[PDB]
Amino acid sequence: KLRLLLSNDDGVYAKGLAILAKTLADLGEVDVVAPDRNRSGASNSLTLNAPLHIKNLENGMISVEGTPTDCVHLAITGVLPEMPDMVVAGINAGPNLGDDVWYSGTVAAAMEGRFLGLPALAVSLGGELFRYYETAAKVVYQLIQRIEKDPLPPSTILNINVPDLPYEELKGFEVTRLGTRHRAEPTIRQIDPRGHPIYWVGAAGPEQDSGPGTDFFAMNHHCVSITPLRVDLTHYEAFDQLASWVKRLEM
Amino acid sequence: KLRLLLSNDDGVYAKGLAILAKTLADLGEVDVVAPDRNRSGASNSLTLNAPLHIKNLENGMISVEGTPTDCVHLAITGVLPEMPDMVVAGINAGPNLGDDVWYSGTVAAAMEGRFLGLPALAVSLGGELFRYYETAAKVVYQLIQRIEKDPLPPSTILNINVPDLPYEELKGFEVTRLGTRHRAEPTIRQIDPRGHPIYWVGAAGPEQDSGPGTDFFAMNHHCVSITPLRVDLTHYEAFDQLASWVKRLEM
């Protein structure tokens, strides 16, 4: 069979998502469960205090009045009649590189697919212009066909970024680590029309660790970037110092 | 004098936060910057699409019309006059164990207090009754007191869960790894007053990986559980295998 669950964070009507769904429709059964509108910065947020409305669209897609994580979670806990085999999230309007991945709703939807039997993919198109969604879609199509022939470890979550170029201009595929940024920009305080102060979250800081081997570098050099993400947040490297510290607390 | 920034995800009115703030005010200068509403499930979502209104309450707590991550992020990028020395989030009404940390606003607040340099603690009280916030407050007091004299690595973020028991009934402190949960409970479908289907996210699933060494195991045996969390999401251990697989993709 191969049943693919697709979601995104740009909203159910986004171009990135429609192109991905059309292209993957040739590989298996595609279900789309996506937010009804733009949910950037949603990260892995779940809506817990309120219930969500859900609408079946004329085109077959399912639109949810909730977050990207809400979409995938609901989809794999009863909203879909049949359990999907993997999650693919995207194609995002914009890159998800380095520190940005921590806040990304696109990455979060993929992460929610860790419960399934096959790898989950998050896919993002770089730049600000978004001219070649078809390139990202082709990359994903290829990854899935291979995953069928050549299994990856279970609970593999791949963060994929694709240069906004024609497929032929792509310089290769690279396994990368997450780059880093410098400190975030300060908050911006303004005064609203009634004289109440308001504060914007500042922009992310400039790229810091962006050298060879990072996702930033691969993208800046026209390579598809593929980063495998941890599903266990335990800092094992810290155990030695922390455990001895806890031992010293016994009085 | 030690500067502590306190936040939470239960909201600025929560008993857990009030107790924690009263207790730690003895150890240093405390600034409280917390959401004006219950933001359970917020994960590290950030408000990017709009500016945030912030207000000072009569008791000196700062109330933010946004997420727990918004609170800490704004607090450390120009809302406050001085950089805090550490961030303490909680005390949460309910445990944050294993998988929970992906969605927890409380954990995210502490985590935001890390990858901008600062040490940080997330603190959660177990169970569903929350009879002994004072116990979690006392535990945190002792850990911070000790941290001042017997320093942990500067990059440390701790996820702390406290059994809901009188302090005298705690069996100890334990370093732990994140356990795992079984599949989450089914979505709960209802109909709204106007005849439209609505769906509630179901409760977290039962403990799966719950044996010796895990946070669940420590909590089940009445120990305070202490898990250090990592800031690098790159799954390095998977690189070599993934790199090899990407080459076969390119074949």
- The DSSP code sequence of B97-161 is -GGGGGT-HHHHHHHHTTTTS--EEEEEE-SSS---HHHHHHHHHHHHHHHHHSPPPTT-EEEEE
Residue (of A50, A45, A176) closest to A103 by Cα position: A45
CB distance A228–B243 less than 8 Å?
Answer: no
Q: Strands across the sheet with A188-191, in order?
A: A188-191, A197-200, B52-56, B62-64, B29-35, B3-7, B86-93, B120-125, B157-162, B223-228, B172-175
As given in the structure block, the two tokens for residue B114 are 């890390």
Q: B64 by DSSP, 3-state: which?
A: strand
Contacts of residue B151, Cβ cutoff 8 Å, sequence gap at least 6: none
Calculate how close chain A gets to B22, using CA atoms only, in Å: 23
Query: Contact, A177 vs A213, CB < 8 A?
Result: yes
CB distance A186–B77 less than 8 Å?
Answer: yes
Calculate how close chain A gets to B52, using CA atoms only, in Å: 5
Task: Specify the amino acid at residue B108.
Answer: A
Residue A40 in marked binding region: yes
Instruction: Print burial letters for A16-38: b (CB count within 10 Å at least 16), e (below 16).
Output: bbbbbbebbeeeeebbbbbbbeb
CB distance A41–B42 less than 8 Å?
Answer: no
Helix (H) or strand (E) holding A215: helix A215-220
A2 backbone φψ class: left, alpha, beta (φ>0; ψ -120 to 50): left
A206 close to B (CB below 8 A): no
DSSP state of B187: P
Rounded Cα–Cα distance for residues A249 and B146 (Å) = 8
Rounded Cα–Cα distance for residues A185 and A202 (Å) = 5
Range of the domain at A54: 1-250
Neighbours of A50 (CB within 10 A): 11
First to last CA, chain B: 62
A229 close to B (CB below 8 A): yes
Query: Contact, A73 vs A134, CB < 8 A?
Result: no
Q: Which positions in chain B touch A75 (Cβ < 8 Å)?
A: none
Please tell me chain A's helix, strand, coil percentages from 3-state DSSP, rounded to the nearest 5.
30, 25, 45
Residue with the two structure tokens 């850990």: B143
Instruction: Compute the residue count for chain B.
Output: 251
How many domains would you assign to chain B?
1
DSSP state of A35: E
CB distance A152–B245 less than 8 Å?
Answer: yes
CB distance B245–A142 less than 8 Å?
Answer: no
A66 backbone φψ class: left, alpha, beta (φ>0; ψ -120 to 50): beta
Dihedral in degrees, nearest 10, Cα atoms A246, A249, B2, B3: 50
Query: Contact, B122 vs B156, CB < 8 A?
Result: no
Resolution expressed in Å: 1.9
Rounded Cα–Cα distance for residues A108 and A45 (Å) = 8
A185 close to B (CB below 8 A): yes
Give the CA count within 13 Å in the CB-facing half-sphere of B249: 24
CB distance B229–A233 less than 8 Å?
Answer: yes
Q: Which positions in chain B touch A113 (Cβ < 8 Å)?
A: none
- Please name the member of A187, A239, A249 whose beta carbon is closest to the beta carbon of B74: A187
CB distance B48–A197 less than 8 Å?
Answer: no
Residue (of A182, A181, A142) closest to A162 by Cα position: A142
Rounded Cα–Cα distance for residues A157 and A87 (Å) = 10
B208 close to A (CB below 8 A): no
The experimental technique used to determine this model is X-ray
Residue (of A25, A138, B86) closest to B75 by Cα position: B86
B225 close to A (CB below 8 A): no
Calculate how close chain B gets to A60, using CA atoms only, in Å: 18
B220 close to A (CB below 8 A): no
Instruction: Print burial letters for A159-194: b (CB count within 10 Å at least 16), e (below 16).
Output: bbbbbbbebeebeebbbbbbbbbeebebbeeeeeee
- Please name the member of B103, B156, B245 whose beta carbon is closest to the beta carbon of A46: B103
Annotated binding site of B: 9-10, 40, 92
As given in the structure block, the two tokens for residue B124 are 């959660």
Q: In chain A, which residue's Cα lies nearest the Cα of B111? A: A102
Rounded Cα–Cα distance for residues B116 and A202 (Å) = 13
Residue A92 in marked binding region: yes
CATH number for B37 = 3.40.1210.10
